């Protein structure tokens, strides 16, 4: 009758907490490939039989923009890269002189392996299983695991590659649709194959070519994908036409699409993919060209800007044989213009992205928490004294 304070132990209550996750992967460790060599000593085998518990009426706020797992993933990837793809020349400005590091320049096999992150003893990872959840808020379907699924540590810009697909629909996951200083990072519910090949055995040199590649995108898939994307953009901007453009300027890694295979760093001109304007869900941007292939002109470079903080690096010249990349476009790191001076139209551009954004699009489903079993509530009992 006095609502006596009663202490209850074993209460299923948790808080977000910071710990360091460990990695696991299905390392082979004998092909002398970078990811398998790294994984050999960096990671443990994956869990052959992980369990998952689905919680009942549980709602949890998942903020993908503040998920610290991202920073941990970032640090492991940098170590992998520094321990593998060694440039001939690495330039680090220091404030403001320049420090130059020179290293042997062997080429290495380089093909990503999925890596899983797992909770240490005493911790667990909450997973958001709501297929319609865009992030930054309440997830109404929460389950618990020790380990996340494996994620392929792909480094790229504009079009992100080989990620996961949405269960049913293309999902916009912007922190703020109307801010204009943040990305859209839309993920797809369908992967679109992009096939990039070198014109093998074409050896030609300029004088006082060799460094060339071509990327082929099905036009049909691209058309379907963009029609669906603009429909979602139209929902956000219901009285406006959607127009796509190329970048306004900036470093080559942003202006063109960037990716790598083996030791080769590719830059591709995506202009052919983004010059449309949908309004009545129709553009005729492609004249029903019947080519069925949107093709990009690509180049292979030796001197590139590093993604790993500010600095520049040079790699050895190209491999003499055939180079091929086969990737899944699984999302677009699109951005939007200011819009303040526009009248009835919104402009989108593919240029953009950095590595933290690429991981946010993969790690948004997971949060790490710990249970604090001691709780208090009032009740009707009294202790005899």
């Amino acid at each position: 009758a006095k609502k006596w304070v009663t202490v209850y132990y074993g209460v299923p209550v948790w808080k977000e907490a910071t710990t360091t996750l460990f990695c696991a992967s299905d390392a082979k460790a004998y092909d002398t490939e970078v990811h398998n060599v790294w994984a050999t000593h960096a990671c443990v085998p994956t869990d052959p039989n992980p369990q998952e518990i689905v919680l009942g009426n549980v709602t949890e706020n998942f903020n993908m923009w503040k998920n610290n797992m991202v920073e941990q993933m970032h640090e492991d990837i940098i170590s992998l890269w520094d321990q593998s793809l060694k440039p001939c020349v690495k330039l680090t400005p220091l404030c403001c002189n320049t420090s130059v590091i020179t290293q042997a320049c062997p080429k290495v096999s380089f093909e990503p392996i999925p890596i899983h992150y797992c909770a240490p003893a005493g911790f667990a990872i909450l997973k958001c299983n709501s297929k319609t959840f865009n992030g930054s808020g309440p997830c109404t379907n929460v389950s618990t695991v020790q380990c996340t699924h494996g994620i392929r540590p792909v480094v790229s810009t504009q079009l992100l590659l080989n990620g996961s697909l949405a269960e049913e629909e293309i999902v916009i996951r912007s922190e703020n649709i109307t801010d204009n200083a943040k990305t859209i990072i839309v993920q797809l519910n369908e992967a679109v194959e992009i096939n990039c090949t070198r014109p093998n055995n074409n050896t030609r040199k300029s004088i006082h070519n060799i460094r060339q590649a071509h990327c082929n995108i099905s036009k049909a898939r691209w058309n379907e994908t963009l029609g669906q994307i603009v429909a979602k953009l139209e929902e956000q901007f219901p009285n406006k036409t959607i127009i796509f453009n190329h970048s306004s300027g900036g470093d080559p890694e942003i202006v063109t699409h960037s990716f790598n295979c083996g030791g080769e760093f590719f830059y591709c001109n995506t202009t052919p993919l983004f010059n449309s304007t949908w309004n009545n869900t129709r553009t005729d941007d492609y004249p029903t060209g019947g080519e069925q292939n949107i093709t990009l002109q690509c180049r292979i470079k030796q001197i590139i800007n590093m993604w790993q903080g500010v600095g520049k690096a040079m790699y050895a010249p190209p491999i003499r044989g055939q180079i091929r990349c086969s990737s899944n476009i699984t999302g677009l790191l699109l951005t939007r213009d200011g819009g303040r001076d526009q009248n009835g139209t919104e402009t989108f551009r593919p240029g953009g992205g950095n590595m933290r954004d690429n991981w946010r699009s993969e790690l948004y489903k997971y949060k790490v928490v710990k249970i604090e079993p001691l709780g208090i509530a009032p009740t009707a009992c009294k202790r005899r004294v």
Binding site: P12, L55, A121, A377
Partner: protein, 128 residues
């Protein structure tokens, strides 16, 4: 040992009832690295759960609650912490929601529990 994880989403009242039911039934009797790396990790997780449990069971002695899961007090509710009724909080809230409602008063309450325990122990020894 946190078999109460599956209780998440239930109300505080419901959780209490579920444990009583389970207690009656239980009491009444009603490729090598993939195996050994994880073997160690699972044992570490279970040994740790036991150690934290035992630690807490003894830490609670400071409030006179040693060895117990549920312990009753001699400190009343102050109603500044929350002015809801017992049925409202036990029937329409989960443990997590409840904790959030009063998570800024926990140190106050913890302090009071320590203090009343000290005074009670003192009173008994003075009487003896």
């Amino acid at each position: 040992i946190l078999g109460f994880l599956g209780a998440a989403g239930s109300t505080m009242g419901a959780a209490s009832m579920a444990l009583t039911v389970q207690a009656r039934l239980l009491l009444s009797g009603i490729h090598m690295l993939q195996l050994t790396v994880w073997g160690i990790k699972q044992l570490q997780a279970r040994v740790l759960a036991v150690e934290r449990y035992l630690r807490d069971q003894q830490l609670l002695g400071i409030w006179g609650c040693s060895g117990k899961i549920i312990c009753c007090t001699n400190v009343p509710w102050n109603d500044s912490w929350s002015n809801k009724t017992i049925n409202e909080i036990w029937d329409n809230m989960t443990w997590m929601q409840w904790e959030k409602e009063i998570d800024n008063y926990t140190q106050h309450i913890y302090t009071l529990l320590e203090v009343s325990q000290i005074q009670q122990e003192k009173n008994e020894q003075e009487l003896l």
